[PDB]
Amino acid sequence: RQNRRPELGDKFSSRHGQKGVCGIIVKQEDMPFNDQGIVPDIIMNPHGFPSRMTVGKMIELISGKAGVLNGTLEYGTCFGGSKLEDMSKILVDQGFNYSGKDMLYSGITGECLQAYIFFGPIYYQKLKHMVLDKMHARARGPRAVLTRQP
């Protein structure tokens, strides 16, 4: 038996078909924060959504955030499910932006950010292929009996 902590290298996923590897590990001071001080957990760049055309994560994050403040779990089905216009009505009563597009300060310098942010809870499941049992090196080791090769 052994356990381990998700240090960098470990392959993560997104449940909409995005392979992804942990780049670095920042501290909490460097992370940004909203008006309430909620620090986000995972960062991904916006540069996947035009290429991968993954509209689902763009609407799941809206479907997720309004459900938490209402305290209710929301159904995402194929060919149906909960719509958008009834979902924007919920969190605008809570006081947030009408499509989750919030704004938050920078943790490294203090002031506002010139653009707006997009925010919410998304479901990141860990995969296999962790890196602690793939790093290996053979400096000078055993040789084959027929070829004298590694």
Partner: protein, 146 residues
């Protein structure tokens, strides 16, 4: 997208009359096949050009397609306006059985929105008939590497 539909309507009903333009290339019943792909490739590029002059600045699929960073003017157009018609190795989704594609569509009905074309955007959603026609070219994107 209805302008191209009723232009197709006068172009599909010329089977009882028997019209044949006879382009150079020995058509023999493809003039009502090889032309609709030309006009469906007109509505596929025109509506994608309406967005560029009618979208505001500081728009992120716009500002990274204005550069050569990642994307195009066609990639954003399939996300907001229309996804176009799926092609299969130079064929506009040929028939599945009994001169048709699906049990959801009538007999020998040679219209787009029934063979290949899907008119609604990824933001709007996909119907259970048109969901399958996207899921054929998406298979072709993985086969051709092999």
């Amino acid at each position: 997208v209805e302008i191209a539909y009723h232009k197709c309507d006068e172009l599909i009903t010329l089977f009882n009359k028997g019209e044949l333009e006879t382009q150079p290339g020995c058509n023999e019943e493809q003039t009502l096949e090889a032309k609709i792909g030309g006009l469906l490739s007109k509505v596929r590029e025109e509506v994608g050009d309406v967005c560029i002059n009618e979208l505001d600045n500081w728009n992120a699929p716009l500002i990274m397609a204005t550069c050569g960073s990642k994307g195009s003017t066609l990639n954003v157009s399939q996300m907001v306006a229309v996804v176009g018609q799926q092609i299969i190795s130079g064929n506009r989704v040929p028939d599945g059985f009994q001169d048709r594609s699906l049990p959801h569509f009538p007999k020998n009905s040679k219209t787009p929105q029934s063979k290949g074309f899907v008119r609604n955007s990824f933001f709007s959603g996909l119907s259970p008939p048109e969901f399958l026609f996207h899921a054929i070219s998406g298979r072709e994107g993985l086969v051709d590497t092999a």
